[PDB]
Design a binder for this molecule. Structure first.
Ligand SMILES: Clc1ccc2nc(N3CCCCC3)c(-c3nnn[nH]3)c(-c3ccccc3)c2c1
Length: 134
């Protein structure tokens, strides 16, 4: 009931920092990094009962995940990794862990002022992506 109210909406990328390095750390190859790094995706978040859906729509790739908090699921990432993901709420932050091939990355989505701030970490490399209402 009302868990993710402040996340619901259509969010357009307005700034990105260190995403190319993050992608390199994750194992994305050169051509994909270049093309993905140009894109300005829309992240569309909705809730129906306990089910949260997060879609990303872009010129490069479109992605979609639906999930229940705390319940592991299969995910195909934009770079075509086949991962096992779990998303929880921790102190009002959506925390998304992706596991594949013995590796792990954590993605946090936070509401800060009128923005949605997304921090992606792979080992020592952190990237920040800022999205505003579309
Ligand atoms: Cl190659 C590659 C590798 C990993 C990626 N992870 C992303 N996420 C950042 C937002 C939180 C979830 C993770 C995103 C993304 N999704 N929505 N906005 N950026 C992309 C991506 C998708 C479409 C167009 C450009 C970039 C992406 C691309």
């Amino acid at each position: 009931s009302h868990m993710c109210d402040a996340f619901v909406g259509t969010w357009k990328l307005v700034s990105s920092e260190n995403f190319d390095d993050y992608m390199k750390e994750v194992g994305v190859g050169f051509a994909t990094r270049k093309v993905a790094g140009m894109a300005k995706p829309n992240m569309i978040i909705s809730v129906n009962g306990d089910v949260i859906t997060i879609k990303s729509e872009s010129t490069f790739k479109n992605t979609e995940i639906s999930f229940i908090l705390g319940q592991e699921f299969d995910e195909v990432t934009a770079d075509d990794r086949k991962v096992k993901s779990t998303i929880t709420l921790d102190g009002g932050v959506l925390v998304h862990v992706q596991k594949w091939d013995g590796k792990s990355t954590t993605i946090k989505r936070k509401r800060e002022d009128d923005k949605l701030v997304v921090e992606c970490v792979m080992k020592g490399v952190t990237s920040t992506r800022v999205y505003e209402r579309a």
